[PDB]
């Protein structure tokens, strides 16, 4: 109220001596003691389930860390780190200790979900694009997202550093219908070749989209403009 007015937080929440501050979100008040008069402080609070809830606000006021513990303030249940640019990463734990779910959310709304995480890392991988959704697996060395159309399988790999590599395998065995691929890590383009003749280019953009550019009949140069993919069947149709 007075002498602590308010300020908005990363994630649509508010925060308002013997510095002192008081916050409130999720139907109950959280209060603590900060170090400055901007909102840089932790916020303690308790839930009806006797579970301990902790909100850690960074000193730059651009990174909120909301944590949920059991009746003991040590064993955690969920942990959602939200940044200023909406770059969120929420985790959930199986009560064994291991993280069972990890929901990575990017700035442009594209979320990256992981479910069914075993004790080693193998788990269901599902990336939520805009208009369509990709699914795949998770190995301990990369994130693999696969799109299948008959024999052709489009594998979008994601290294743990974050760079994207894409390959293509075809169980076909006909020199006129077999589909090979060519990847360019610099231009981020996958070029599909059929019978020693190029067919189309797929570009994986830094805006987390995919564009399709069909080659001409002679397979020497592109033609027309690129079509941003909106339906999942548009990715399958390019693999036909």
């Amino acid at each position, epitope marked *: 109220e007075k002498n602590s007015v308010s300020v908005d937080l990363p994630g649509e929440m508010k925060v308002l001596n013997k510095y002192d501050l008081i916050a409130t979100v999720d139907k109950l008040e959280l209060k603590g003691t900060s170090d400055k008069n901007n909102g840089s402080g932790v916020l303690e609070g308790v839930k009806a389930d006797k579970s301990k809830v902790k909100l850690t606000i960074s000193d730059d006021l651009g990174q909120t860390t909301l944590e949920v513990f059991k009746e003991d*303030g*040590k*064993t955690l249940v969920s942990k959602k780190v939200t940044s200023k640019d909406k770059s969120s990463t929420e985790e959930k734990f199986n*009560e*064994k*200790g291991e993280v069972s779910e990890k929901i990575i959310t990017r700035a442009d709304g594209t979320r990256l979900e992981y479910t069914g995480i075993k*004790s080693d890392g193998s788990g269901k991988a599902k990336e939520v694009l805009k208009g369509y959704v990709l699914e795949g697996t998770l190995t301990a060395e990369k994130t693999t997202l696969v799109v299948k159309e008959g024999t052709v399988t489009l594998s979008k790999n994601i290294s*743990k550093s974050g760079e994207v590599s894409v390959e293509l395998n075809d169980t076909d065995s006909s020199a006129a219908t077999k589909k090979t691929a060519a990847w360019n890590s610099g231009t981020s383009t996958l070029t599909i070749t059929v019978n020693s003749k190029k067919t189309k280019d797929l570009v994986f953009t830094k805006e987390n989209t995919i564009t399709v550019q069909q080659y001409d009949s002679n397979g020497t140069k592109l033609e027309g403009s690129a079509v941003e993919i909106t339906k999942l069947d548009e990715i399958k149709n390019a693999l036909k």
Partner: antibody, heavy 126, light 108 residues
Framework: EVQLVQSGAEVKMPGESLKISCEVSGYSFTSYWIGWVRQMPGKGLEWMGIIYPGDSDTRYSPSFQGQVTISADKSISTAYLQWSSLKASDTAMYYC???????????????????WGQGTLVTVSS | AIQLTQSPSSLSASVGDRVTITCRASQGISNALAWYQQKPGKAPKLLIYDASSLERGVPSRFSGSGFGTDFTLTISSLQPEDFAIYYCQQFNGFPNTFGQGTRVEIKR
């Protein structure tokens, strides 16, 4: 009420076997991990291994893999630290510790220890 | 594994001095650090976990902060019963590693 009671001191010769126990009470024994920490004579702290009695999952530190057996018993709320054969260099004080799990990025987890046992001293000489 | 280096080795301060102890890692362990207090005889006792959160029962004069690779344990108003050895440990990268400790004495 959380208490971790360990076994008594031991005197062993090089080559003999030994199993020390950590009788547990105060909390839900099946919910928390149980670790083991070594303290060489007047020296630092060495973490040996850990056990989760919910499924008897032994995570051995590489410095002690194949050198010591860690077991648990959910029926009696007791953990164990067992040696196949004692060596003269194994003389140290050993602690059983209740552990709090933390998901370290990435693909794994580690723990910190909030409640400790009183310590069991193992002297190995001939 | 991950090596942890503390500072200093020994220390002497009078009752009331704000004493700080450092713990330097070799990697980015941003939040995974714990502080223990081994008193004369036995045994180690958890003081501060997650490098900021204080354990129940531990007096308010004990505090801790840190991020990245540099961390600092801080006693606000030293007390004679606070004479002990203080260890830091990392639990961000398997396996858990401890620091070599830090001795704290009292001047009178």
């Amino acid at each position: 009420e959380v208490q971790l009671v360990q076994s008594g001191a031991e005197v062993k010769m090089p080559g003999e076997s030994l199993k020390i126990s950590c009788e547990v009470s105060g909390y839900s024994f099946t919910s928390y991990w149980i670790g083991w920490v070594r303290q060489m004579p007047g020296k630092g702290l060495e973490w040996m291994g850990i056990i989760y009695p919910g499924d008897s999952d032994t995570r051995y530190s590489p410095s002690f893999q194949g050198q010591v057996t860690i077991s648990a018993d959910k029926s009696i709320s007791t953990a164990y630290l067992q040696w196949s054969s004692l060596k003269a260099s194994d003389t140290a004080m050993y602690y059983c510790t209740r552990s709090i799990s933390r998901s370290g990025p990435g693909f794994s987890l580690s723990w910190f220890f909030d409640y400790w046992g009183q310590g069991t001293l193992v002297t190995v000489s001939s | 594994a991950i090596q942890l280096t503390q500072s200093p080795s020994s220390l002497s301060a009078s009752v009331g001095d704000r004493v700080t102890i450092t713990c330097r890692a070799s990697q980015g362990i941003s939040n995974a650090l714990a502080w223990y207090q081994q008193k004369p005889g036995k045994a180690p006792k958890l003081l501060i976990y997650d490098a900021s959160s204080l354990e129940r029962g531990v007096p308010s004069r004990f505090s801790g902060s840190g991020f990245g690779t540099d961390f600092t344990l801080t006693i606000s108003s030293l007390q004679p019963e606070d004479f002990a050895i203080y260890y830091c440990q990392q639990f961000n990268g398997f396996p858990n590693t401890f620091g070599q400790g830090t001795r704290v004495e009292i001047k009178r």
